[PDB]
Amino acid sequence: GVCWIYYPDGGSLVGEVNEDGEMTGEKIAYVYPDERTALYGKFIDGEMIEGKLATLMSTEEGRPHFELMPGNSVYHFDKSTSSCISTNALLPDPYESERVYVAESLISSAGEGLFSKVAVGPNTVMSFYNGVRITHQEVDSRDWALNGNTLSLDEETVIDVPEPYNHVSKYCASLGHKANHSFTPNCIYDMFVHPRFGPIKCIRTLRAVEADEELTVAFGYDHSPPEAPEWYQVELKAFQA
Template sequence: MTGHVLVFLLCIHLFKAQQLITNCKNERSDLWKPNTKDGLPIRKFINSFTFTTAQPQNNREELKYKLDIITGRVAVVRGANGISWTQAGSLVRDGWLYDDPNNGYTLYVYPDFRTGILGNFNLIGELIQGQPVKIIQYRYNIRSLSSLERALFFSRCSLNILQIKISQPKETSPKFRYEKMTSFFAGSQPTVMDPMERMNVYIGNTNMGEGVFAKKDLFPFQLICYYSGLFISHEDAKTMFSNMSLNELKTNSRYLVNYNSTHLLDVPSGNLAQFRSSLGHKVNHSFRPNSRFVHARSPRFGNVTAIESLTFIKRGSEVLISYGYQNISNPFLDWYK
């Protein structure tokens, strides 16, 4: 839905004093190139937004942009060809909405820059319905230059925007939509895996039971998986657990994590046959973690807890996190070996 991706319009404003440029200025070709396994070319474009006070050259059309008034970061970029990239939330790990009016589609781009959800979105960027796809190619829109222009300016990006190509959604692919998590509802597709997680991780056996392992090399500060489920208020949790014995408490709170000052997150079941729409709850504890808890916005789950890498995690290695236990004598750590 063209034009439906300018989310959070009340929180962004046009900044006209400077001109926005991207790494498109360094490109010499507008040919389509294959996306890489780590999505690095697209990631570099997103990370390249910089400002200059120089006046635009006659052969360059100015890139339109808007800033997030809270963070000061670029929230929307739009090329002269109408293609736009809109930040899907206030954090980099929240992903982007890519709108291509020339080909008539809108895509949620996961922060791995390889995976997306092609679909329809409402005016505030929530997913109405969509299917998973892969981002397979990219190119920079570079206008053909005369020999004199090329000699004077090298390669100038008249459109200054990155364009992407995607795979066609499979007929058998699931159809996703945004669903608000509550204390009794964890989504209507509890056994359908998240498409980014399917690319990033797999479940394997450890001496502590099931664990999460890297399906590919994961780089520092990369979003690995989500921790979605049931949102339970602190007050409700006190009522639920007040009359339980220690053994009952350990059993019923094994996957319970703090979300914020008012709510906790839990999963409806630790059995993967019943719940695997996100796999964050299967990441095991370690006193030497290689990942951490963060907040992130998911197109399916909304604002949830997520797991982000702290260090380089080699393919096949277990993803480990600290649950905040101070020492191994904690009674809730009897499963830890």
């Protein structure tokens, strides 16, 4: 009796369920959307207690067979709060680290950007947008200078990567806040349920992307409330024209 339970984003939990049909055991895995990278070990009712990095090597009769990676690379469920971004700010996501890197943006005066490490097809999850969880009230009350990295999650929650966590030397557990804006983007923000970060958003490709291509997303600020930083207002004029 092996069960696979998929999230709408393509990640899954897999293992033998307990008596009560819960994902509880010492041999449960979260499998990322590549259907190959996994976090394997102790879960309780689908929550990751101790997941070790693994590669899904094959399935036999539906049952996944994993090989553990070397290192003592372990992860656990660690949802951010209003004040804490991560228990391990410097521990990278292992799926994201194989797919993207941060470098100088090709967009003029845009600072750093996020780039593809390898060629990927359409609909590929590339990066995760984790951050602290604050209210729309807090965000909407403060200056644009403090709102460079704020991403609406839902009606009650905004995800932010505030200073000094906007620098990779201080935070690199996720890198989605590094993707720059484009009115002609190659990626979108999409909902994602992550075993370490909880419910967040990810960056997903719209189309095939080449290695070393800059990943961009449409930030989606209200154009007719435009409520936006000045650099975006400028770019909006150019795009429309």
